[PDB]
Design a protein around this ligand. Structure first.
Ligand SMILES: COCCc1sc(S(=O)(=O)NC(=O)Nc2cc(Br)cc(N3CCOCC3)n2)cc1C
Ligand SMILES: COCCc1sc(S(=O)(=O)NC(=O)Nc2cc(Br)cc(N3CCOCC3)n2)cc1C
Ligand SMILES: COCCc1sc(S(=O)(=O)NC(=O)Nc2cc(Br)cc(N3CCOCC3)n2)cc1C
Ligand SMILES: COCCc1sc(S(=O)(=O)NC(=O)Nc2cc(Br)cc(N3CCOCC3)n2)cc1C
Lengths: 317, 317, 319, 317
């Protein structure tokens, strides 16, 4: 039986018999994702170059405006905005959304994969809405996922029921369900990190990476892949198995990836698909944030690969 | 003034006062690339999943059929075909085309960027067309380039006039001229290779990559990027500068990449854009091939970076 | 504030506190309309003509609407211009709604790239008996929702419900139906009549005199213009947008008209009246005819209220 | 073998051994039509309605700007411009183009089919170009045709070699050759005109239409179709056979349609397809214009049906 993103959410939304705000939120998010994909693929670029005589800004504006107008959100945290956006009272709903509207777009000059990352919370305090409402642990996520604008445009959605993948058919502008209840391999064969920071690695990371290239059990060495765009890297890990690392280094002593709208949604997806996501010291999903743009070190992926790293991490205290 | 690929090629053909076969060839290849792109982006996937009731093969068939029906070709070498394809006599034209119809498609399941690589040679003799007509060194190339099916679709075309980049506007199916006569940085800050096989590196490769991570002076260590799809990694090298390595080692004395439809067209693009491309022992374009599928090692990118590799390469010779 | 078909239906559905089957029905129908649109605009035809080396459009349209409706879990009986008998949804997929639809109206002239369209009307199931074809023999008055997709110069979905008529433009760049005309109402009186005057030799006397009055007005006013696309969805949408009258009247050779009551006349009569217009068979309201055959025909005269009344004045003059 | 608009034109130009200007002309117009098609189908209308926060004017600008930049034209006559546009000197070529960029657009609110019509003349003298270059009889046409934005988008091109029909494949942005060397039926079964203006008909039109509803020889009456969009009605006459009339009456002694960029290109398309096109008194292509916007009555279509009209016209002298 064919399924679309909209029918899938609505059917899951009917079973839960909730208020319907989460469905309008996700439906609006889906529309923004299609608009972003169309602009990322350069639809209408001929008009910019004079056939008749900024991208991350457009993406943020698309997501901001579809979310505000859904009547489903109250607080919006974006990589593009310094402060949280408080939805005006007539459009206020009960959900908090943290999102990177176009992650990896700093390198978009080379047509590298980019993506949108999002995490959805139910507002937790009864106070008037403020930035504090987005400072929740990832354990509290109601919904999370990403759209990868890669060779094709895919939407990965994780909820309590698990992880589902939707391929965007651009001929009809519909998200088609193609991979139901996806689960990551117990053990992968690809590790993913920027080895250029090798001079600033902590000893556990140095030793773990050494074990991937020169296995102590004479097994096959892992291959390395690092796209430099987090959505593309995490999606490859989920589909192929393996491990993704962005640990702390000298230029980024608290890590580089953002906890609210990069690490937590990926940690959410990883855990619902049977993977792991750790900072080294604790679960990514267990970090309680204090700042909306705060950074975190992150190691995620197939459980055997993350546990093997934690085993090495504990060797170094 | 707005410019498209089709208007552009024709204007180059009129200046050159050629027979027009090469213009018909490039226009045919452009139509194939637009068809491949539509398929990579999953147009019509809704019909596959039962809404109303092969990707490397199709790419090959699109290029093959558009090339044969251009009346501009006589011999076709494909990554997908064991022997060269001899165009039937009624359709024979004067050019020889080597191509990879969908490079990177082994990992297309994770929606990594893929691409089409192509190199166009003039047939050299009036003898009956045969595979021997493809055994020319890359130096004899009349035209070469690639299509990157990335976050957007771009066609990079190199001729005697230089390297030009065309963006595909999917709204109108036209390739828009966006980067004229592009030149690679004299020196970059990114190195690209699969570091997972460090256990099998040539010792010279080991020392070179160590220098990128641990510079003996006070310069910045390079960042690492490796998509694992050649078109994307080389295109990132062209736009940003840096170095791309798929080198020879002991276990693979000739490298892994294919010379005719991976190494040569890219080596040609690099050199017309002011880069360098070497096997370690000689320039890629100078290798005389003896097998249409023979492998070659390739190291290309910014010239200062390739020369630094050659300096390390000679230290171990 | 931007609004979409999906957003619009869902919040209207939330207000009503209904079961949600109607929204999943409408959302599925939206998906079929976009897939039909893609095929009508000839997406992928290069492959038909051998770019690398399959089914007729009205067959594909029927399969798209049929399959999207069945898989919505919202329908029980489906009546199609393409199928002799009503289709009874299998039990595991059954919902409480009856949908009559024309999957691709006007396709007789699709070789000339004429405007084509999809027509649809949605009913509620009335009895607790096992679902059967007679559940589709309800009068148009019983319509829960009705509308059409017009595949013209652009693709528009016109949706009529109790809250009124709303028009949605398909933006193909993002595959979204954009609300562009809220609460549409037809002009009180128009300047265009629509019918096939080539068959005037077989006209009933009332139609002949009414068309005579349109070309040679007895009050020496300006004559109406004539437009006839020959594609029903295009002609009726022009009537709604510009005003005037659309006629497919009964004659001696076709005393019950030629258009089909369930999936052409009833949905169009529903849209017209929700937009403040009229639609009559000559003898009665289109929406009041109680059908006895799912493919039974009805004559139809619709459009602006003053133009239909002027027709009816002529109709009664001829008994 | 598959054929495209671009490949088809190029092969015709090679056979003729021309300067290439006419090929560069047609290729630019082909791109303008694809851009018009995209806007007509309402690409990007969501951005007009605030998803992130005229049409014939745009169409004129697209045609004007693609033709100017083709370097193949010197004089442009448009339904949208009162005076002819004289191409700037660096961009001047030897061809004169008359075009209606978006015909039927007054009724575009009801989504009636619309279209672009064009006729191409060679220039008249080496003197500095002027509007006088557009005052040619239709007989002097080098090429003419139309794009119909109907249920799908089709381009009909007429040259000395005949009439060919090209379908726009919107998934790849190519015009695919679908109807080669089309020939109109000798006799049709549909007549097309605005019967609402019957009070002012000349007796010949009155008597001819009478013959279509009430055949004196016991034949079947013709059907009536009138869309109100000239490209749509004329395309139907070509595809199904029959007759289209926008004739002269007392209030419009020269008709309503414009001779240079509505009547003449259609008469040329008709005559190259074996049909006829008359004003009643003479063949449309034989009218020598004295004003670029002068009107002409037109009756075109299947030859038996036009000849039938003419004898009714001559019966009334
Ligand atoms: C982890 O949880 C994720 C699961 C959830 S819950 C939500 S929700 O909160 O938006 N709820 C609803 O959309 N509900 C809903 C929707 C429709 Br259609 C009909 C009805 N019914 C009307 C008749 O009476 C019964 C309820 N309800 C979305 C998702 C994906
Ligand atoms: C090393 O740079 C190669 C550059 C080249 S050459 C070719 S080509 O081989 O296809 N040739 C032509 O397209 N020729 C051509 C085209 C047109 Br339109 C008109 C004329 N005419 C000759 C002059 O008189 C008028 C007619 N010629 C393609 C490219 C990209
Ligand atoms: C004919 O025009 C009538 C208008 C109607 S009614 C229907 S419906 O029947 O499909 N029902 C619903 O859509 N219901 C619905 C949907 C969502 Br989301 C949430 C909730 N609620 C959850 C919270 O608790 C209350 C119910 N309900 C569709 C239309 C367009
Ligand atoms: C009105 O129907 C006439 C048909 C015509 S003529 C023209 S044209 O005027 O633009 N000319 C050319 O396109 N010429 C041309 C094009 C190419 Br590619 C190569 C060469 N070569 C020069 C000769 O040696 C071989 C190479 N020439 C277009 C059309 C469609």
């Amino acid at each position: 039986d064919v399924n679309t993103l909209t029918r899938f959410v609505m059917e899951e939304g009917r079973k839960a018999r909730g208020t319907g705000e989460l469905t309008q939120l996700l439906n609006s998010l889906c529309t923004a994702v299609k608009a972003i994909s169309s602009a990322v693929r350069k639809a209408g670029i001929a008009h910019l170059y004079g056939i008749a005589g900024k991208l991350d800004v457009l993406s943020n504006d698309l997501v901001m405006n579809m979310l505000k107008s859904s009547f489903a959100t109250c607080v919006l945290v974006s990589e593009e905005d310094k402060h949280a956006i408080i939805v005006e009272p007539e459009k206020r709903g009960k959900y908090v959304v943290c999102f990177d509207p176009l992650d990896g777009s700093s390198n978009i000059d080379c047509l590298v994969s980019v993506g949108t990352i999002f995490g959805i919370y139910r507002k937790k305090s009864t106070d008037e809405p403020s930035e504090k409402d987005a400072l929740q642990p990832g354990r509290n996520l109601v919904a999370a996922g990403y759209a990868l604008y890669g060779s094709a445009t895919m939407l990965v959605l994780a909820m309590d029921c698990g992880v589902n993948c939707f391929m965007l058919d651009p001929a009809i502008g519909e998200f088609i369900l193609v991979d139901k209840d996806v689960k990551i391999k117990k053990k992968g064969k690809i590790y993913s990190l920027n080895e250029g920071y090798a001079k600033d690695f902590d000893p556990a990371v140095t030793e773990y990476i050494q074990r991937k290239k020169f296995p102590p059990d004479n097994s096959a060495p892992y291959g390395a892949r690092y796209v430099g765009s987090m959505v593309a890297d995490v999606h490859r890990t989920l589909v192929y198995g393996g491990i993704f690392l962005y640990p702390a280094n000298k230029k980024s002593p608290n890590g580089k990836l953002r906890l609210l709208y990069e690490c937590n949604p990926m940690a959410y997806v990883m855990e619902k698909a049977g993977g792991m996501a750790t900072t080294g010291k604790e679960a990514v999903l267990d970090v309680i944030p204090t700042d909306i743009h705060q950074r975190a070190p992150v190691i995620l992926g197939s459980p055997d690969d993350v546990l093997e790293f934690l085993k090495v991490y504990e060797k170094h205290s």
